Amino acid sequence: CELLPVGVGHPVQAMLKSFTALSGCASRGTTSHPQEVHIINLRKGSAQGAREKTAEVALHLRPIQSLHVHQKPLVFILNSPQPILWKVRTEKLAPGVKRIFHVVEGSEVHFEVGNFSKSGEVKVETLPHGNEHLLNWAHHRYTAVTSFSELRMAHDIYIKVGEDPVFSETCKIDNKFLSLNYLASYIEPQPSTGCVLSGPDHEQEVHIIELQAPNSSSAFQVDVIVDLRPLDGDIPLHRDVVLLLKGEKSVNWVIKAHKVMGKLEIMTSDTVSLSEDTERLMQVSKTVKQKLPAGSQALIQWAEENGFNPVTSYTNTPVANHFNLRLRE
């Protein structure tokens, strides 16, 4: 088992997931204004995968922690470098509330349930690229902005609609400002080293994930998300796999398995949580908190001593907080 870079087709894919914004500000002074304005200054990323297809960006709207139901009209100045389809996947928002989406030319607004589309409105306007110029335009056409957010291009954007009392009544773009209410989620591959000792077994499999740091500057326990879904297609599979999760620091492993069936064995030195989807779809044995050895070879030998051999695959990701597990047909 020579430590070599993990290939794209490897059943274990290591990604780092982070919620961040390029910049932004928030203001509670729009309470007087009957309409609230939110700005999402998307910025095109360095990725070359967006060349011809028109990028379609979803949206996740939720009431702020201090609000349960939101009814006030919400204007969204969704300026973007290029036309985008705004799939407004609202949530916990009262229907029938007008939602004016000021978008660049060619951008469309789509709603999961037609009630929102019938009540909402879409106005196409030309807006400045500059953050300050866009904020000035928003002030000129509305006299105030509830919040502004410059985010890098992403597929989803979680927004907590509502005026947070903590933030002042004035909005000033500050590069050091970041809040939960306005975040953009990003995921990128991370380097890893591993090997494959045994091929895909339809009886029981052993995939080992080693983690050094969760990419956290603090010294506390954070969540490590491991996805388990079929490698190809959406056909549910009946398979048994063994997960040896190694964390040098404290990290709680949250395993989410979708469209997979069978018995799963998890052995790790850290607490493990399983989503209800994994619980109902698969039978996961209750892990015993053991002081597992350190190092790839030591853990491999320890597993071989427990009869969970041969190892289907081993992989180690120094820096990451997200894992995807794919089952070969």
Binding site: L178, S217, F220, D223, V224, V251, V254, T271, L274
Partner: protein
């Protein structure tokens, strides 16, 4: 089953999550996270009689021993089962970062 909704819609003295406001600076003394300055972590509390969600038969054994021998002081305890990670935003150097501090929001309480 014994989630937040079950014990918040109706008051049950048995093992379940009860409301608790955790404050970093005051209650917890943590000041290394800018915000959330405070959140909710509903903590597990309440005893479980013999007729309860006792997954491990040892818990049933302890319950029976206590019932037949009340002066034992050896009974199952209320423990979190599944805990939801908490998002947090904090600055390292001049760089803000959002992390998920796992297993600090308690939703499901079992007995063991």
């Amino acid at each position: 089953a014994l989630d937040t909704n079950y014990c918040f819609s109706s008051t049950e003295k048995n093992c379940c999550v009860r409301q608790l406001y955790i404050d970093f600076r005051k209650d917890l003394g943590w000041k290394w996270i800018h915000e959330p300055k405070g959140y909710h972590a509903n903590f597990c509390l309440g005893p479980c009689p013999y007729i309860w969600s006792l997954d491990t038969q040892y818990s049933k054994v302890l319950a029976l021993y206590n019932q037949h021998n009340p002066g034992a002081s050896a009974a199952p305890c209320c423990v979190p089962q599944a805990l939801e990670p908490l998002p947090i935003v904090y600055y390292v150097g001049r760089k803000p970062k959002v992390e998920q501090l796992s297993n600090m929001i308690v939703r499901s309480c079992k007995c063991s």
